[PDB]
Every structure is written in structure tokens, then in C-alpha cells.
């Protein structure tokens, strides 16, 4: 197993993964790495798992009928593991704890959001399709970039959205465009 957490890449009390040499705080991972199980397997593993039990799940989608589907158990794993897929970014830091708003120039947004209360919202099972976790997370970003405006800090919004973006057609099997 790796010596650091795959998520935050630090050392620490590490739980290492039974079919792949990953290792993850508790918290890291997600969901958070479940008390017994042995063997256990992580958050990866079992995405790849699904895409072996039906390759033909690799083939092209449509965003539209993605964003529709249920949360039964493949997509509730699934946005789990796109959630972490943007905490692997170390610039995801600036997203994760519950923002405030006291800029000159600038009003907050109206329903402020951050990835630690869309981690709450998947845990607590809120979410009833796709569409409510993908809808959250943009919003995260495009709240980020409406209220810093023309400062250069901005562009942390654009990057953790393409990483959130580039995951999101990885994950789901987006049909490839140009
Ligand atoms: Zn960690
Ligand atoms: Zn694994
Ligand atoms: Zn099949």
C-alpha cells in the first residue's frame, strides 16, 4: 500500500485499500472508510468493478438523460467518487469549508454552497437524481466567479470546475464532442 493519503496526500492514520494499493484517512475517503469489512475495498475499486460487471456502461450518454437518472446505488457511488475526484485537487481547499461575503463592490450570492455541505447532502441521501448533486456542485463554482468579479482570484473557480467538468464526462461516460 502507498505510505500517504490518495485524496490529501499526507501521512497519517491511513486505511488501506484490500484490492489496490491506495490508502485513505477515514475522512478522505468517501463514503468514510466503514468500520469493519475485511477485506475492504476502496472508493475506486468499486467504480472500476462496475464498469467490468457491464462494459457496455463505457459507451457514449447524453449529459440530459445522465442528469435524470435516480440515485439508486450506482449513482450514489458514483457522485461519491466524482465529490472525491475534486477533492484530490489541492486547490479544492478554497471550496470545502462554508464561505462569507464581505467584499467591497460586491453582494454574496443567494444560496451560497461548498463542497463539505454537498459531502453532508450525499451522506444524508438528499439527493433523489443526479441532477440535485451536478446542480450543487456547478453552483459552487459559478457563485465563486460572480462574486469576485474581474479579480484575478477568480480563475480558482475555473480551474476546480474543469477538474469537476473533466471527472464528470470520465465518470458518467459523457458521448465525446467536439
Ligand atoms: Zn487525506
Ligand atoms: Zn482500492
Ligand atoms: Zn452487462
Same mark, same amino acid.
Given at each position: ?9 499526507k ?5 488501506? /485499500?484490500?484490492? /489496490? ?15 469493519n469489512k ?15 460487471? /457491464? ?34 485537487d489541492?486547490?479544492?481547499?478554497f ?5 462569507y ?14 463542497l ?7 451522506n ?11 446542480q ?14 474581474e ?15 473533466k ?12
Amino acid at each position: 500500500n502507498s505510505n500517504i493519503c490518495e485524496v490529501c496526500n499526507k501521512w497519517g492514520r491511513l486505511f488501506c /485499500c484490500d484490492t /489496490c494499493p491506495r490508502s485513505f484517512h477515514e475522512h478522505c475517503h468517501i463514503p468514510s472508510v466503514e468500520a469493519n469489512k475485511n477485506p475492504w475495498s476502496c472508493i475506486f475499486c468499486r467504480i472500476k468493478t462496475i464498469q467490468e460487471r /457491464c462494459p457496455e456502461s463505457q459507451s457514449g450518454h447524453q449529459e440530459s438523460e445522465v442528469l435524470m437518472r435516480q440515485m439508486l446505488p450506482e449513482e450514489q457511488l458514483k457522485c461519491e467518487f466524482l465529490l472525491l475526484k475534486v477533492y484530490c485537487d489541492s486547490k479544492s481547499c478554497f471550496f470545502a469549508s462554508e464561505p462569507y461575503y464581505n467584499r467591497e463592490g460586491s453582494q454574496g450570492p443567494q444560496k451560497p454552497m461548498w463542497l463539505n455541505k454537498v459531502k453532508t447532502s450525499l451522506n444524508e441521501q438528499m439527493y433523489t437524481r443526479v441532477e440535485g448533486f451536478v446542480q450543487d456542485m456547478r453552483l459552487i463554482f459559478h457563485n465563486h466567479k460572480e462574486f469576485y468579479r474581474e479579480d484575478k482570484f477568480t480563475r480558482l473557480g475555473i480551474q476546480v470546475q474543469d477538474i469537476f467538468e473533466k471527472n464528470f464526462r470520465n465518470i458518467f461516460a459523457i458521448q465525446e464532442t467536439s
